[PDB]
C-alpha cells in the first residue's frame, strides 16, 4: 500500500547534459519529474529592463525580450534568492534579484556586436552562461548607435515564462522495445531502434508483455547552461517534493479544520 523504491544509474554526465535511468518508480512519477525539469525548476533570468538609451535598429521590447532569454549561471544563487513577489523590500534588492547593466555605444565604423559579454552583473556568481564558445548576440550596432540599459534578473519558474526554463531538451523514453505495446506500430519494421533498444537486429519489437509495467525511464536532461545538468535534476526532485509537502500541509489543515 506504499511507495516503490526507485533506483538510479547515471549513464553519461557532461557539463551540458545528464543521461540517467530511473528504475522501478512509476510512469506518472517519471513524467511528473520530466515536467518539473521543464517547468518548475527555478533559475535566474532577466525579468526587468529599464532602457535609458536605445538607438539600435531593434525596438526596446525586442531588446528586452532578447535579454530575457539570455541564460544566467544561477547554479547556486537561485536556491538563495527569494521570489521578488515574496521579498519584503520596496524595490529590487540583492537578496531577491541580481542587477545587470548594459552600456554600449558604437563609436567606430566596424559594426559593434553587443553581446552577453556586455551585460555586467552586480554579482560575480550570476553571470550570463557564455561568460563562463561565443557570447549571445543581443544587437549589432552601427556607428553612433548606442544601447544603455540596466536590468534585474530574478528567480522564476519555467512555468511562468520560458525564459526560466532550465532545460534545452528533456529526452524521456521508456520501454524502448515496445514490450508494453503502449505504442502500436502498423508496420513495426519501418521504425528504427531506440538508442536504448535491447533487441537484436533481427526482431523488430519486443514480444508483448501482458503483466508488464513501464519500469525503466531513460532521461537525457540537457541544460541551457543556467544550471549544471545534474543540478536541474536535484532541484526538480527538491521542487516536486516541496510541492507535495506544501500540498500535504494544506491538506492536514483542511482535514483538522473540518
Amino acid at each position: 500500500p506504499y511507495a516503490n523504491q526507485p533506483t538510479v544509474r547515471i549513464t553519461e554526465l557532461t557539463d551540458e547534459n545528464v543521461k540517467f535511468i530511473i528504475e522501478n518508480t512509476d510512469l506518472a512519477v517519471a513524467n511528473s519529474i520530466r515536467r518539473v525539469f521543464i517547468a518548475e525548476v527555478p533559475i535566474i533570468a532577466i525579468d526587468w529592463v529599464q532602457i535609458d538609451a536605445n538607438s539600435s535598429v531593434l525596438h526596446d521590447e525586442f531588446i528586452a525580450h532578447r535579454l530575457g532569454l539570455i541564460p544566467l549561471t544561477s547554479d547556486d544563487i537561485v536556491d538563495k534568492l527569494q521570489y521578488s513577489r515574496d521579498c519584503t523590500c520596496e524595490e529590487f534588492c540583492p537578496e531577491c534579484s541580481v542587477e545587470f547593466t548594459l552600456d554600449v555605444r558604437c563609436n567606430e565604423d566596424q559594426t559593434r556586436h553587443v553581446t552577453s559579454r556586455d551585460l555586467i552583473s552586480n554579482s560575480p556568481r550570476v553571470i550570463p552562461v557564455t561568460s563562463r564558445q561565443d557570447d549571445i548576440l543581443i544587437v549589432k550596432l552601427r556607428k553612433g548607435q548606442e544601447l544603455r540599459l540596466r536590468a534585474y534578473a530574478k528567480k522564476g519558474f519555467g512555468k511562468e515564462h520560458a525564459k526560466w526554463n532550465p532545460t534545452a531538451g528533456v529526452a524521456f523514453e521508456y520501454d524502448p522495445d515496445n514490450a508494453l505495446r503502449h505504442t502500436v506500430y502498423p508496420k513495426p519494421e519501418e521504425w528504427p531502434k531506440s538508442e536504448y533498444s535491447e533487441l537484436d537486429e533481427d526482431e523488430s519489437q519486443a514480444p508483448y508483455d501482458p503483466n508488464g509495467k513501464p519500469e525503466r525511464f531513460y532521461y537525457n536532461v540537457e541544460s541551457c547552461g543556467s544550471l549544471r545538468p545534474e543540478t536541474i535534476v536535484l532541484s526538480a526532485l527538491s521542487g516536486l517534493k516541496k510541492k507535495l509537502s506544501d500540498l500535504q500541509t494544506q491538506l492536514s489543515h483542511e482535514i483538522q479544520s473540518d
Binding site: 538607438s55 535598429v57 531593434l58 532578447r66 532569454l69 539570455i70 541564460p71 559594426t111 556586436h113 553581446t115 552577453s116 552562461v129 557564455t130 564558445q133 561565443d134 557570447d135 549571445i136 548576440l137 544587437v139 549589432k140 550596432l141 552601427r142 556607428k143 553612433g144 548607435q145 520560458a162 526554463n165 532545460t167 534545452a168 531538451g169 540537457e222 541551457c224 547552461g225
Partner: protein, 66 residues
C-alpha cells in the same frame, strides 16, 4: 531579423552560434556539417540556423548619423 536567442521549439541557446555558423561556412564546411560542428543535433535547433535570415545586417546599412 536578428538570430533568435533560443531555439523556439526546445530551448537551446542558438543566439551565440550565428557568427560561428557563418565562420564555419566560410571555412567551407558543408551546411549541415556546420551544424554538426556547432552542436545542433535536433532538427528543431538546426532549423534555427538554416532558416534564419539575418536582416539586421541590412537594417544597419541605413544611417541614423554617419
Amino acid at each position: 531579423m536578428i538570430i533568435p536567442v533560443r531555439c523556439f521549439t526546445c530551448g537551446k541557446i542558438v543566439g551565440n552560434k550565428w557568427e560561428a555558423y557563418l565562420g564555419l561556412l566560410q571555412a567551407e564546411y558543408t551546411e549541415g556539417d556546420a551544424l554538426d560542428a556547432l552542436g545542433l543535433k535536433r532538427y528543431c535547433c538546426r532549423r534555427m540556423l538554416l532558416a534564419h535570415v539575418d536582416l539586421i545586417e541590412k537594417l544597419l546599412n541605413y544611417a541614423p548619423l554617419e
